[PDB]
Every structure is written in structure tokens, then in C-alpha cells.
């Protein structure tokens, strides 16, 4: 149902780099910039990346975010115990005039 | 910032629903709360933006009304009431403070949520 | 290590068409036009391809350049035994704001 | 356009960097001579550019302030010096005329190069 198409599902072990892609429209990504969000289960969602290239309270430099085209792409390097969290990307739309999100994608912790 | 929202909704299909979120050691004119649905393990999903001043707001492009917007400065709290409710209704309430810029858009801090079943 | 990747060394019979590849991001192929130069073997680097379209005059028309989105192709064509060089795709970056350049790839001319 | 360089120099790491590259064959104070270095394997890698008058120069972002490219009319002249020396900076240093509209714009002509071993 939404407009940024993430994964729904993802899995990684403790200390490898792994990459989420957002993929939407030119009037939303192409024309606007993409927020990474990141929300530990049962607690309120953060932001993690924001302006594809600032972090908005000092938060762990490891994570970085990338944006080509139409598409977006977060990369962590520095899997760790609590990164279990939904993921979800945000961008200002035109056409419908607001903050199209996507569907969010699950980046868990591997035994 | 801290933004506390009301607790767990039960409601009956095709009732109204009424959530507030309040502002706390902040200038709640200008602070302002974009509310954005929520699903358990899914996607967020704005509903809407409003100011406190004059009153203007602006709701999801989808739905040209279903949710109405309200705000008391004096309160510093912002309703939202919810109609014609179905069940893909059932899903969380978060608000959201503005980023910065006098905080009329973008968003920064959630509230604790507001789960309701439909 | 350059930003824009380039395959290592591309052969092919004499006559044949080889086409080399050049990747990346819209910042500076798809916002900037791709450019190709070869460098023979122990010899200055000459200008091969400029803004993908235009040659200037000695070139053959063999060599064609072609860009799509955040890819560029050249197909050098005719293969002859004189072909073998380096062969560097570049173009403006406005995030580093300033010129990049591919990794180069050496073509081969087979027997 | 004959354009003359400087030959192939090994000072060993810590040591200095000399690239001299001479104009010749036309109007010096209106061709300039931007600096390219070819890392092995890496395909061409830009490290800046040179305004014969005034005296304004560019730099790689990558690279610091340590490069240093200046402009010499009267020898019509182009000097390029590296404080850094390590084994990275092993290349070969190609200046070339930067095409036309007063030449300071995009790589045409490269001279025959300097090969540095570090």
C-alpha cells in the first residue's frame, strides 16, 4: 500500500554492513530528499538519517544513508544487540501534497 | 520535548474516536503536532498537519474529511476525532513535534502512541 | 578506488564491437554528461568521446557514446589491432564538485 | 601544442615533489595546465586546477591544502608541488590545456606525464 517500496522482512548477524532499499517517483524522491526512521519494537519510532547526510542528535556516526534517482538505500556498518527495529523512509510528495512513508522494513539481530 | 499521548481505544465500527496528545515545557504555539497512523509491525501513514494559530490544517489526501482536527493553546493539547470507523482502523496514533523552523512541518519526536482496536 | 567503476580489460576479435560500461549515481552522470578518453600503451591520453554525442573530426564513427540515467556505454565497434588502451569514462561530481573518472579498462585485440 | 614536462622523479617517501609542465607553441597567459594523476589500476584520479592570471587555483576535495599549483607567465609555466609522499601517491602526473573558452574548463591535450615511485 505504500508509496516507497521497502522490504517487508531482513536479517543480519552482529557486526556485518547490510543495505535496505526505498525505491519511489521522481516528484517525491527524484524532486526531494528521503528521512530513514528507525523504531524499536513497542516504543516510539526515532529518526536515524535525515538529509541523506546529517544525523539529527549526534547519533552513531557507523550509520549512512545514500539516495541515486528514485531510489534510497540505508547502510549500517555495526550490527549490535538492540538494532532489531522498523525502518521506514519519509519524503514530502507534490502530487499528493504530503509526507509519503513506506511500508517498513524489519532489520533483526542473527544468533 | 516530551509528547504524552492517551492510552489503549477500544471502539465499536462506525463510532467516533477522540485522542489527545499534550505539549510539556514547550511553546505550544509554536510547537506544533502532525499526526501519523501507525500499524502494529507495518508502514506509518500521515493523517494530517495543523498550526495552533488561526486554526488551519491540512488532512490526508486520501480522505477528504474522516478525521477532524483540534487544538487549545490555553491546554496546550491537540484532538484528533476519528469517523466511520472500519477495521483496517486498528492501528497506533503517534502526533509528531515539527522538526525545526518555528516546528510547522517535518518531523522530529513521537509521542508514547495511541493503539486503538476497531 | 575512482567513484565511477569501469569492467578491468574487455577483448574482442579484430572487427568486432566491444562496449565498455561506466556506473554510478545521478549526482554526476545522470546530472553531468559522460566523456570517454583513451590512452594508448606508452603514449598521452587523446579525447576519444565529449559530452556523449560529439566527436572532434579524426575519430571514427566506430566510436559512439551513449548515456542512460546513471549508465553510460561506449562501443568502440570495428575492433582493430591499434584498439588497445586504456580507456577512461569521466565526468563533473557536484558532491565533490569537481571532475571523476572510471577505473579504466584495457582493451585487448585478439588473434 | 607541444607541451613540455618535467621528467620521471623517485625521491622516496617523506622526501618532495617536482612537476614542472612548460607551455609551448601558443598564448600561455590564456591556456592553463590542471593537474591529473593515474593510479595503478584506478583509472584517472583528479587532483586540481591552475588560473595562470590573478593567480586563483582549485584543489581536490580528497587532497588538502598541502598540493600546491601556481602559474608562471613570464616562463609560461605550470608548478605543481606535493607535501605529501606515501606509497599511494605512486602515479604518473599528467597536465593537460583544458580545452577552449579561455581554457580553464575540462581535459583535451595531456603532456607526455611524470611517473613518481614512492
Known amino acids: 500500500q505504500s508509496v516507497l517500496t521497502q522490504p517487508p522482512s531482513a536479517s543480519g548477524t552482529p557486526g556485518q554492513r547490510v543495505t535496505i532499499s526505498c525505491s519511489g517517483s521522481?516528484?517525491?524522491?527524484?524532486?526531494?530528499?528521503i528521512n530513514w526512521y528507525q523504531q524499536l519494537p513497542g516504543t516510539a519510532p526515532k529518526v536515524l538519517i535525515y538529509?541523506?547526510?546529517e544525523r539529527p542528535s549526534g547519533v552513531p556516526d557507523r550509520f549512512s544513508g545514500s539516495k541515486s534517482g528514485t531510489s534510497a538505500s540505508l547502510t549500517i556498518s555495526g550490527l549490535q544487540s538492540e538494532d532489531e527495529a522498523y525502518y521506514h523512509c519519509?519524503?514530502?510528495?507534490?502530487?499528493?501534497?504530503?509526507?509519503?512513508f513506506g511500508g517498513g522494513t524489519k532489520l533483526t539481530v542473527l544468533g | 520535548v516530551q509528547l504524552v499521548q492517551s492510552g489503549a481505544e477500544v471502539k465499536k465500527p462506525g463510532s467516533s474516536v477522540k485522542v489527545s496528545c499534550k505539549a510539556s515545557?514547550?511553546?505550544?504555539?509554536?510547537?506544533?503536532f502532525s499526526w501519523v497512523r501507525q500499524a502494529p509491525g507495518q508502514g506509518l501513514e500521515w493523517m494530517g498537519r495543523?498550526?495552533?494559530?488561526?486554526?488551519?490544517?491540512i488532512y490526508a489526501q486520501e480522505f477528504q474529511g474522516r478525521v477532524t482536527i483540534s487544538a487549545d493553546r490555553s491546554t496546550t493539547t491537540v484532538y484528533m476525532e476519528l469517523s466511520s470507523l472500519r477495521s483496517d482502523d486498528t492501528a497506533v496514533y503517534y502526533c509528531?513535534?515539527?522538526?525545526?523552523?518555528?516546528?510547522?512541518?517535518?518531523?522530529?519526536?513521537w509521542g508514547q502512541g495511541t493503539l486503538v482496536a476497531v | 578506488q575512482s567513484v565511477l567503476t569501469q569492467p578491468p580489460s574487455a577483448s574482442g576479435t579484430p572487427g568486432q564491437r566491444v562496449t565498455i560500461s561506466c556506473?554510478?549515481?545521478?549526482?554526476?552522470?545522470?546530472?553531468?554528461?559522460?566523456?570517454?578518453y583513451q590512452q594508448l600503451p606508452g603514449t598521452a591520453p587523446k579525447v576519444?568521446?565529449?559530452?556523449?554525442?560529439?566527436?572532434?573530426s579524426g575519430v571514427p564513427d566506430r566510436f559512439s557514446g551513449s548515456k542512460s540515467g546513471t549508465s553510460a556505454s561506449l562501443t568502440i565497434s570495428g575492433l582493430q589491432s591499434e584498439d588497445e588502451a586504456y580507456?577512461?569514462?569521466?565526468?563533473?561530481?557536484?558532491?565533490?564538485?569537481?571532475?571523476?573518472?572510471?577505473?579504466g579498462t584495457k582493451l585487448t585485440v585478439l588473434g | 601544442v607541444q607541451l613540455v614536462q618535467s621528467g620521471a622523479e623517485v625521491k622516496k617517501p617523506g622526501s618532495s615533489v617536482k612537476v614542472s609542465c612548460?607551455?609551448?607553441?601558443?598564448?600561455?597567459?590564456?591556456?592553463?595546465?590542471?593537474?591529473v594523476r593515474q593510479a595503478p589500476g584506478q583509472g584517472l584520479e583528479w587532483?586540481?586546477?591552475?588560473?595562470?592570471?590573478?593567480?586563483?587555483?582549485?584543489?581536490?576535495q580528497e587532497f588538502q591544502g598541502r598540493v600546491t599549483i601556481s602559474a608562471d607567465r613570464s616562463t609560461t609555466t605550470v608548478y605543481m608541488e606535493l607535501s605529501s609522499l606515501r606509497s599511494d601517491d605512486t602515479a604518473v602526473?599528467?597536465?593537460?590545456?583544458?580545452?577552449?573558452?579561455?581554457?580553464?574548463?575540462?581535459?583535451?591535450?595531456?603532456?607526455?606525464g611524470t611517473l613518481v615511485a614512492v
Open positions: 538529509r541523506n547526510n
Open positions: 521522481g516528484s517525491n524522491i527524484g524532486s526531494n530528499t
Open positions: 519519509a519524503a514530502w510528495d507534490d502530487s499528493l501534497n504530503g509526507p509519503v
Open positions: 515545557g514547550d511553546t505550544f504555539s509554536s510547537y506544533t
Open positions: 495543523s498550526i495552533p494559530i488561526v486554526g488551519k490544517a
Open positions: 509528531a513535534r515539527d522538526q525545526s523552523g518555528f516546528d510547522f512541518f517535518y518531523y522530529d519526536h
